[PDB]
Amino acid sequence: IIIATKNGKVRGMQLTVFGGTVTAFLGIPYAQPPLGRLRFKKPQSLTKWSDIWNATKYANSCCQNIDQSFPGFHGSEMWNPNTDLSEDCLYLNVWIPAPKPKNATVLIWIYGGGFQTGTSSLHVYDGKFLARVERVIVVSMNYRVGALGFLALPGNPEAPGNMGLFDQQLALQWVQKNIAAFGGNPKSVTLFGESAGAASVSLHLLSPGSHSLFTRAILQSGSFNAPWAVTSLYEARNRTLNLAKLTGCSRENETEIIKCLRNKDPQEILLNEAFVVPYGTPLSVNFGPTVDGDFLTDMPDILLELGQFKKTQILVGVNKDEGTAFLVYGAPGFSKDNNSIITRKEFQEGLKIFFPGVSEFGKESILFHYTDWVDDQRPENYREALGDVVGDYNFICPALEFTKKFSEWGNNAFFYYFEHRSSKLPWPEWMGVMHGYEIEFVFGLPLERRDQYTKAEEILSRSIVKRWANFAKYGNPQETQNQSTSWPVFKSTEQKYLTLNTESTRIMTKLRAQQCRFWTSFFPKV
Template structure:
């Protein structure tokens, strides 16, 4: 046997070298080379170190054929099979979208811009699997927001690894088409029927049903969750019967299908499509010729011109969004909601404290991210007129009357905060509350939250408060990464939210096996209890923004009706009046009605409308605690009529 001069066996030295090499190769390859066989082909994932453990990520798995050429604007087609191993170790393309260039280099806006290449070949999804690989794990499918105009699943704020690691659930996130490429429609024409982006989401959910078992997931325990337009998308799936078998439960964060920005009428959708076609020189003798022309335009040209389809300025710039197509959506959302045509399941839903501020810095007079945005009364009034361009003058006046702090009407902070409340109530909070009330009325278990914590990492100014979208980092567990320097209290809050969301996904209740602390109550149509989420102890309150939402749901539509005006995109409706009376708002109705009475004394015809409306209210307003609230003095109105006519 050969030996070295020091007596060590050459074979022994060779064996030691071989073992070291083997350990190195084993360390590199198996950790970075994980292969799973889906129904369409094999995919290679990657192990990620997370909080002292491991999560296996499969990034950029294709679920749909690239919607190019003749497939543009159409429903997606399932991805064809592939023969090679698909590399799913890095994020795929983002769908074509306009980039927010309002504040170049500013982290608060740049964090939402796509971080991968833009392409129409973008129908991909991501899967995060806890390690060791589970058996029959609950699945949580994330749908991003972006007003149906933008968004991508590859953003760091949507990283599913912390949720998968801490709660041992499988997290899935999906890309879907947005803007004109996702929602352009000529209703009734199969070349562009509308809702392509929603059908993308449904196809991804079908992929989950067919494939999640090989990742260790349970296809019978799938919870959808999303924020803003993602939450509206979740509610669309709740309202669309073909989606019902594809998921189990739902979580809606700051958005719902009945929001004024979330649906277009047929006529408005058609007008916007034809406007875009004209801008792109796509004229034709029929709709099919127009669509064929649009299918052959450069996608960047479509993006650059879609911003010109609106006939008026708007803080919430939604150019193309879902429509009633008779397929995915059979009626307008509020009609389906009123008729109770939901998937019968459990719902976790909520909103943030300052939902409106995110939109104000994008064009409201006097607002800026670089100062305190203390606006005066004139800027407040102009801002409202621009925010509600289709409302009558009296409609705008009624908003001013309701939201002005009459005890301190010269305070610029109050006008700034009122604009936040108006935009947030009208576009987010009140539609979400209405959806929730109808959903709970059917006996479904609902859990409502009110997120109150302003992140210590927030780049936006202090006056913007707890902004739209900034609960997401806590739901995905970003504060658990110590090197990012969140506070300890924020880490604790994030862990609590992770547990709430995952427990709800697993069991249908966020409380899980919790014994200590505040238990999250069920939301009912009568008590309307909700839980606060912040770094302090959670508290339980009732009837969030009840007075303000009563204004938007009942009073404001009546004002528009009286003046012969309506909002084309007005989605909030009046039918809740008989179901959910709120004594605190009756006083407000009376004072607003008297205000309108005085304002209308000069106009006999409008006074007649007002008289009938006030009489209607006086007959329908109930009594509470043995106190009947005052009815309108009709004789005063009649005298005002006579004065106006003389």
């Protein structure tokens, strides 16, 4: 099973899925390793090789810091890298249906992890299911994260910023030059990602050099207009400089500072990334996408507002309890190991955590718009309130505002609201249907009867997997056979969305409307 690419011969491996076969190429290089004098640079192209690459195991994950807050806990460790960390990490994976397809729609997966963490080799990013069940080709790439991939000295090509985004873009390139040899159709490519991956996807909608690299886009719990997604040029400098002071690399020739950080061990760089911002939150994106003038040609809010994006269809959505995950990473009174009923003092104490550099009055207005209870006796009030505040501010309202503005330029948009809690979900019940726990359903993991999921979950995964592929294949995320509910387009007048649950899939209007007026209109004034 050897495939010839533009750079040389690659050999994959044969997997048995659901009494059928998927062919997997794991860990194909897509760029010169960003090492030595190549650290912090845009990813250079790849020289031809005269052999057969063995793409038969996942490559190295990119250098990154690891969630060590909950050691031994599957709920947090299922997200930490599962391969060697190295700077030599610019690789990608291809799953093709067997027998080899002819002109298959390609799905390209971009992982999240706050632009600091993440790897494609994760179990819940395994694309052999979608290859098997829907007959699509699934690609996912590793891209640089944290300072190694997003450190920004605006202007200087030695550290121009947005390198991790250019990694991704060189991967879409590779698919464009090479996927046709795997049976894929480069004119039918749907990007999809989650969290920072979904923010990443929304940025390729804006970046003119990605316009011709994909057809459509699916955004899961993330968009570039979310408060954590874009770092300013102000902060990107102060963060770059503080990394330099922290490593003794402070020079005056801006170029010499980068040469200094290049002769430092990858670890010394990882530990100092924590402290470059004087007060962090659980959602601190220390080194993220900046307005660089190469990938991103302008402030993305202005680009979005004025219609300067790829005109195509989008699939956009969010989970019911986006924000709860972050409450146990700092919010006082919370724990994954009790029900975290917090008092009013504790709730206020938690806004200082999540809105650190916000004025007194701004913290006071969050408390105001979230503590007019219908029943003031309910002791979960402040615990649920703080969750929604974090989820509404960081995820739900930016995603709805992205869909409104994008749909305003005449393109079909589809919004979902994922409200099912995995029966296998390892976090406690008070945290709900958390950030990132739709991915297993999107990737069709509940389709494995062995994995101890319930039958209603196999059916829901089955419906979602069909809806995603139909949207990828046909720009229309319907499930047309098993009597499903029809998913209406999100028009900015009526703002209709589809709920995704194991029971009654329903059509509803104007998600979190009262909350999002606060976050999208009022709160940005403070």
